């Protein structure tokens, strides 16, 4: 553990993390002369612990130590500035050998030596892990503690010298560097930090110091939430998650809040007999309890106060979709990787032509020759110019006679501003400095991601393959609102009684067509709906039972194992509880929309629609066509409450 | 779940069955050496005579020349409460010395230091006994020794209406199944600490034995060091080699 | 490739070549051929990147891509020799199966009569058949 004096910025809302307004000029100084901690894997310097994706809740606070039973991590410290620092823990009945509080003792330079660290000099110090923090009774399994300095009970909690001691139980551990996880726990420290009430007070203020900052009352004592202001990242979960939330408050003794979630009932564990609903906080203890989500959307996270909301915390948490495993750019023909950027390519084969199992001995990704490939920088900037959320990317090689040709290892990066390349994706939750890769050629390999990574400038980079660097990375994203879920128009949950066909083709001296299989990827006779006539009169009605919010659509088309036909344009007829075969109104004016069907033969059509389609009996009438009527209709609705 | 499994015919010596001259037993004992057998005091007081035989795995049957450990006379105990139960430990004064055989294995003497390291680690234990504490309708002919866990002290004073002191504590399962009055009275609740075996429990009846699925009552001989020391050195060297070794002592166990 | 008798043959390439040293006669009898063994030997494999010394204290490595084990200095223990030597036992009985009692930055475990010691002191080696506390594992 370290403590280098680094000026941290409290008013962090100017960084535009999740803020809306732009006229937010700071009267005083944005940054404040404080001290931030740091985690080291060794006793000396020049080796820091990269803050992974899971190590998010910290802000001005440093790292979080995770020491359990039969597991101890050293905490060597060396002062860099000119003032002696201290470190004091809380919780167990630790003796003065690992306490570090400035009071009466017994040993000369051991019980209080850690409170006086000389500059440019290391010191041997290590804490002890106990079994007291383990929550008894069948229910919980984690209960965090706190630790800070000890040279002053008040001038240290405002100097950025804080730290929570998250301690769980023993029995359930994961393979994430031998750290017990197997969940998705969160920890938040709500405590204001003052510059005038600290050891590093520069005798004056950044503007005025007459009547406690003439600009704003206690402007140096901003209500910094989690080290920042108007931030609170990482609040991107899914539907129905019983994740554990750790609420810690040690300094805020005269600030009582009551946490109330907008439409999320509470459930207390342990006794398994309480419901509560709301749960306040008391100063001193470390309250922890589950969340249990319900409905998706940007639900606001507030504490029902007037001084710590509009001037404290006001970050709504988002719930994205859980079953958002729909095709993004592989099965469709609209969304593609045409906006791909890179620098070094891998051979002579075609760049975009990288589909799974394609004809020809040239199917990979390259523009320029590879010559020699090693640990250089063959970065592939996979930019989308929009928000992204990836939980799994597949990987497949190539072959044409016997060779394997597969990538064994490749590091991933990301960025959110293009001007800087935050090459830190390789050190996520489970990963530390490596990543999975392909194994063979005829076996599909996938790389599932654990943390909900969000960015905009995705960057991948290979290393070396079986004497032929060839990669074919697919694309698998997810929704943003969390409700656009497939109702089963292609899976099987929506029966034929809802989505009905028009006419049924039947030959005289032969067989008969079955155009009621209007789903995605169908076998047998036909693959979708093909009416007998060929004009602008046939229909394809769908029964949605209840009202839905449709935003995304898709459409492929069927054939007859000879010629391929499709539909070029159609019209969507919206209705309500009753019956009304009226086309969908155009929100940009007052007329009706003119939708377009399948463009080519098998390339799907992907389009977004902001105005909802509140209806139940949606009707589709194909206007134009190609050869014959054919389309694999499938939409994406929501559950409007 | 490990149920009521019988004792092995190898590492289960601590079973000095205390019977009578006729075909009628009463309780059992604990094998540690050749001069003292730890057992309950009500085994002899307010009962009948005393007949001990070590290495006797069965009462109705006999496994050959192995059960021989007769007792001359016996005394009582100072802290032994006649009405209730407290420090219910009595020493059986054998009359004939017995060497160390297969079914007769000695054990090291306990000490006061094994009181803060044996109760916090070994949260379980075994109760060796033929089954004479609850001699109602479970009289098994085979030597049974089930496994019982250890519970916190704050749940032992309410297991029985009698207020229990520090000498006796919980040593059974929760209020689920029958885990009390297991084995013979004076049965050794030896807990395999670490490379050794130290007994630390004596099963006795409090208000008898009925619907006692709550917790059990077992003593702690770590605090009983001052009694096993005052009755071993003050008696002097063995005169006639375990006569009495030595039953000629006062009633309050010196 | 795509054969039960060929998966066991190719499995010796990522073991008797990457972990230890390679050889020409290694893949000759295993593959039962001669056409693929010659092609695999022509491509050399430098093992490993120990010329730049990735570890401190001027430590060396071995013929192994990725994993390695160096002889770090004394006084420092752990993966990359970080944790110092153990001072007191106190808790967990000092990883020894007997009494733990510190003597001012000096801990030594030893059994009494009926038991002996081992080569380092991890556990007392049993000597007597049945002293005062053993377990019969004959059945």
Curated annotation (Swiss-Prot), chain A:
Glycan-linked positions: 120, 427, 626
F5/8 type A domain: residues covered: 1-324
TM spans (from-to): none
Positions carrying Sulfotyrosine: 10
Organism of origin: Homo sapiens (Human)
List of residues binding Cu cation: 260, 262
Domain F5/8 type C, chain residue ranges per copy: 324-478, 483-638
Protein name in the entry: Coagulation factor V light chain
S-S bridge residues: 142-168, 324-478, 483-638
Domain named Plastocyanin-like: residues: 1-168, 178-324
Documented effect of changing residue 519 to C: In FA5D; impairs both factor V secretion and activity
From Swiss-Prot, chain C:
UniProt superkingdom: Eukaryota
Effect annotated for changing residue 14 to G: In FA10D; Ketchikan
Sequence ranges assigned to domain Gla in this UniProt record: 1-45
Modification sites for 4-carboxyglutamate: 6-7, 14, 16, 19-20, 25-26, 29, 32, 39
Effect of residue 32 to Q: In FA10D; Tokyo
Cystine crosslinks: 17-22, 50-61, 55-70, 72-81, 89-100, 96-109, 111-124
Chain positions with (3R)-3-hydroxyaspartate modification: 63
Domain EGF-like: 46-82, 85-125
Name of the protein in question: Factor X light chain
């Amino acid at each position: 553990i370290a403590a280098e004096e680094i000026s941290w910025d409290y008013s962090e809302f100017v960084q535009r993390e999740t803020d809306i307004e732009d006229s937010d000029d700071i009267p005083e100084d944005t940054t404040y002369k404080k001290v931030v901690f740091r985690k080291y894997l060794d006793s000396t310097f020049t080796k820091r612990d990269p803050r992974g994706e899971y190590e998010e809740h910290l802000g001005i606070l440093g790292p979080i130590i995770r020491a359990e039973v039969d597991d101890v991590i050293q905490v060597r410290f060396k002062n860099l500035a000119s003032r002696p620092y201290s470190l004091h823990a809380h919780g167990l009945s630790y003796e003065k050998s690992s306490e570090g509080k400035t009071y009466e003792d017994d040993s000369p330079e051991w019980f209080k030596e850690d409170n006086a660290v000389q500059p440019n000099s290391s010191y041997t110090y290590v804490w002890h892990a106990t079994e007291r923090s383990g929550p008894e009774s069948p229910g919980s399994a984690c209960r965090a503690w706190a630790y800070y300095s000890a040279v002053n009970p008040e001038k240290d909690i405002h100097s950025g010298l804080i730290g929570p001691l998250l301690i769980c139980q023993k029995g359930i551990l994961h393979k994430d560097s031998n750290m017990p996880m197997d969940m998705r726990e969160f920890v938040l420290l709500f405590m204001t930090f003052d510059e005038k009430k600290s050891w590093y007070y520069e005798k004056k203020s950044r503007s005025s110091w007459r009547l406690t900052s003439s600009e704003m009352k206690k402007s140096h004592e901003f209500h910094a939430i989690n080290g920042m202001i108007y931030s609170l990242p990482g609040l991107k979960m899914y539907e129905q998650e019983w994740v554990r939330l750790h609420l810690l408050n040690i300094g805020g003794s005269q600030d009582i809040h009551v946490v109330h979630f907008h439409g999320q009932t509470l459930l207390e564990n342990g006794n398994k007999q309480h419901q509560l609903g709301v749960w306040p906080l008391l100063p001193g203890s470390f309250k922890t309890l589950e969340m249990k989500a319900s409905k998706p959307g940007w639900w606001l996270l507030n504490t029902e106060v007037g001084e710590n909301q509009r001037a404290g915390m006001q970050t709504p948490f988002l719930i994205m979709d859980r079953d958002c495993r729909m095709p993004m750019g592989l099965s469709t023909g609209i969304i593609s990787d045409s906006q791909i950027k890179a620098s070094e390519f891998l051979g002579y084969w075609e760049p975009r032509l990288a589909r799974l199992n394609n004809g020809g001995s040239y199917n990979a990704w390259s523009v320029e020759k590879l010559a020699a490939e090693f640990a250089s920088k063959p970065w592939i900037q996979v930019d989308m110019q929009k928000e992204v959320i990836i939980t799994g990317i597949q990987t497949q090689g190539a072959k044409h006679y016997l060779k394997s040709c597969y990538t064994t290892e490749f590091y991933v990066a990301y960025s959110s501003n293009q001007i800087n390349w935050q090459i830190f994706k390789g050190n996520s939750t489970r990963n530390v400095m490596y990543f999975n890769g392909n194994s063979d050629a005829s076996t599909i390999k996938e790389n599932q991601f654990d943390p909900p990574i969000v960015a905009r400038y995705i960057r991948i980079s290979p290393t070396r393959a079986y004497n032929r660097p060839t990669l074919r990375l697919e694309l698998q994203g997810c929704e943003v609102n969390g409700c656009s879920t497939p109702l089963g128009m292609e899976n099987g949950k929506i029966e034929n009684k809802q989505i009905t066909a028009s006419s049924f083709k039947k030959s005289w001296w032969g067989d008969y067509w079955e155009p009621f299989r209007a789903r995605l990827n169908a076998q047998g006779r036909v693959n979708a709906w093909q009416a007998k006539a060929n004009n602008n009169k046939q229909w394809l009605e769908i029964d949605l039972l209840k009202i839905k919010k449709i935003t995304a659509i898709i459409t492929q088309g069927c054939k007859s194992l000879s010629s391929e036909m499709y539909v070029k344009s159609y019209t969507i007829h919206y209705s309500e509880q009753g019956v009304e075969w009226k086309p969908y109104r155009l929100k940009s004016s007052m007329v009706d929309k003119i939708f377009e069907g399948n463009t080519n033969t098998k390339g799907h059509v992907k389009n977004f629609f902001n105005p909802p389609i509140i209806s139940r009996f949606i009707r589709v009438i194909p206007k134009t066509w190609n050869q014959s009527i054919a389309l694999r209709l499938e939409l994406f609705g929501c559950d409007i409450y | 779940i490990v149920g009521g499994q019988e004792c092995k015919d190898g590492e289960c010596p601590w079973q000095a069955l205390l019977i009578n001259e006729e075909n009628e037993g009463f309780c059992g004992g604990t094998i540690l050496s050749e001069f003292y057998i730890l057992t309950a005091a009500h085994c002899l007081y307010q009962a009948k005579r005393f007949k001990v035989r070590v290495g006797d795995r069965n009462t109705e049957q006999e496994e050959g020349g192995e059960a021989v450990h007769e007792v001359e006379v016996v005394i009582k105990h100072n802290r032994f409460t006649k009405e209730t139960y407290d420090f219910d430990i009595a020493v059986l004064r054998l009359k004939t010395p017995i060497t160390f055989r297969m079914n007769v294995a000695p054990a090291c003497l306990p000490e006061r230091d094994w009181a803060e390291s044996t109760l916090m680690t070994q949260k379980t234990g075994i109760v060796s006994g033929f089954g004479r504490t609850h001699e109602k309708g479970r009289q098994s002919t085979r030597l049974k020794m089930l496994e019982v866990p250890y519970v916190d002290r704050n749940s032992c004073k309410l297991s029985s209406s009698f207020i229990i002191t520090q000498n006796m504590f919980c040593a059974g399962y929760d209020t689920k199944q029958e885990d009390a009055c297991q084995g013979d009275a004076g049965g050794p609740h030896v807990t395999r600490f670490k490379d050794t075996y130290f007994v630390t429990g004596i099963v006795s009846w409090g208000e008898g034995c009925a619907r006692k699925g709550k917790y059990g009552i077992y003593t702690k001989v770590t605090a009983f060091l001052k009694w096993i020391d005052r009755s071993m050195k003050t008696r002097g060297l063995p005169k006639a080699k375990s006569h009495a070794p030595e039953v000629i002592t006062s009633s309050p166990l010196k | 490739a795509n054969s039960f008798l060929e998966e066991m043959k190719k499995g010796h390439l990522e073991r008797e070549c990457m972990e230890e040293t390679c050889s020409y006669e290694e893949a000759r009898e295993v593959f039962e051929d001669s056409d693929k063994t010659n092609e695999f030997w022509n491509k050399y494999k430098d093992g490993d990147q120990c010329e730049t010394s990735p570890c401190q204290n001027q430590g060396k490595c071995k013929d192994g891509l990725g994993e390695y084990t160096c002889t770090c200095l004394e006084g420092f223990e752990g993966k990359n020799c970080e944790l110092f030597t153990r001072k007191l036992c106190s808790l967990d009985n000092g990883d020894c199966d007997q009494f733990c009692h510190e003597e001012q930055n000096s801990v030594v475990c030893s059994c009494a009569r009926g038991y002996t010691l081992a080569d380092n002191g991890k556990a007392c080696i049993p000597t007597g058949p049945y002293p005062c506390g053993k377990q019969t594992l004959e059945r």
